Amino acid sequence: SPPDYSAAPRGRFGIPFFPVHLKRLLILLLL
Numbered sequence: 001s002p003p004d005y006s007a008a009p010r011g012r013f014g015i016p017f018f019p020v021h022l023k024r025l026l027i028l029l030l031l
Contacts, residue, residue: 008015 010016
């Protein structure tokens with residue numbers, strides 16, 4: 001391809017490590 005931009009933004013409309021805490025809820029539910 002041409003190069004891409006998948007370097008996830010943060011501190012302005014972006015994806016920090018947020019799904020950790022939530023997937024940890026699901027893992028605990030399973031546990």
